[PDB]
Amino acid sequence: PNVAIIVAALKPALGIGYKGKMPWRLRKEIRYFKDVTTRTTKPNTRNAVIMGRKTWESIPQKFRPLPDRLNIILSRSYENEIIDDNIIHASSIESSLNLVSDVERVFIIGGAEIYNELINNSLVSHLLITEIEHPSPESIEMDTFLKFPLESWTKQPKSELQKFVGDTVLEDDIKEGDFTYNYTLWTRK
C-alpha cells in the first residue's frame, strides 16, 4: 500500500518544533492534515496514521485516537499487537503493515525521530510537505529540524498533488499572521 510522509516545516532550515512543541497554530493547515489523512477512494477501506510514541502523547486528550483513521504507535519497546479497533502498537513500519488489514493509504505524521529515519526508507514513496515562510525565520525559537535529502527527491506539479488530494481545496500562499504556506508533493528520483 501507498506510504507517504506528511509534515509542515518552516523554510529554509525545515524546523518543526521547539522544546517539544509546534511553533505555530495554523488553522487551515490542520484541516488539510485532517482531510488528506482521512479521504479514501475505495469502499470498505480507511487510512492509517503512523507516529512515534512521544507524538502520540503530545496529541490533545480528546483528539486521540484520531477518528476515522487507524492509529499506529511506534516504540522500540512495543510488541506487534492490536490494542483495540483503532489502535495498533508496533516496533517498526515493516511489522505494522503486516498486521494491517485493508488499509488504503499510510501517513507518517511525526515526530522528528520518526521523520528523520523513515525518509530514507524505500517503503516511503511520497512527501507531503507544507512549506512555511516567515519574513524573519531566525527570530522564532527552534530546536528540532528535518534531515531531508530533498536533492534526491522531485517536487511535483500542483496537478499531481490535486490528483492525490482529490476534491480538496488547494489555495496558494495561505497567509495566517506573518506566516505564509503552500502544500507540495514530492516523489523519489
Ligand X SMILES: CCc1nc(N)nc(N)c1C#C[C@H](C)c1cc(OC)cc(-c2ccncc2)c1
Q: Which residues bind ligand X (CB under 6 A)?
A: 6-8, 22, 29-30, 33, 51, 55, 58-60, 63, 109-110, 130
Q: Is 27 in the site for ligand NDP (CB under 6 A)?
A: no
Using the minimum distance from each CB to ligand X, give the nearer residue, 27 or 42: 27
Using the minimum distance from each CB to ligand X, give the nearer residue, 71 or 95: 71
Least distance between ligand X and beta carbon 24 (Å): 8
Residue 77 binding: pick among ligand X, ligand NDP, none (C-beta 5-8 Å cut-off by kind): ligand NDP
Least distance between ligand NDP and beta carbon 123 (Å): 12
Give the list of residues 6+ apart from residue 145 with CB closer than 8 angstroms, or none. Answer: 13, 14, 15, 16, 112
Least distance between ligand NDP and beta carbon 43 (Å): 30
120 to 159, contacts with ligand NDP by CB under 6 A?
144
- Selected from 72, 112, 119, 174, the binder of ligand NDP by CB under 6 A is 112
Q: Is 92 in the site for ligand NDP (CB under 6 A)?
A: yes
Q: DSSP letters along the chain, please? A: -EEEEEEEEETTTTEEEBTTB-S---HHHHHHHHHHHH--SSTT-EEEEEEEHHHHHHS-GGG-SPTTSEEEEE-TT--SEE-SSSEEEES-HHHHHHH--SEEEEEE---HHHHHHHTT-TTEEEEEEEEEE-SSGGGS---EE----GGGEEEPPHHHHHHHHTT----SSEEETTEEEEEEEEEE-
Cell numbers linked to 175:
497567509
Q: Is 53 in the site for ligand NDP (CB under 6 A)?
A: yes
Q: What residue ranges bind ligand NDP (CB under 6 A)?
A: 7-8, 16-17, 20-22, 51-55, 74-77, 91-92, 110-114, 117, 144
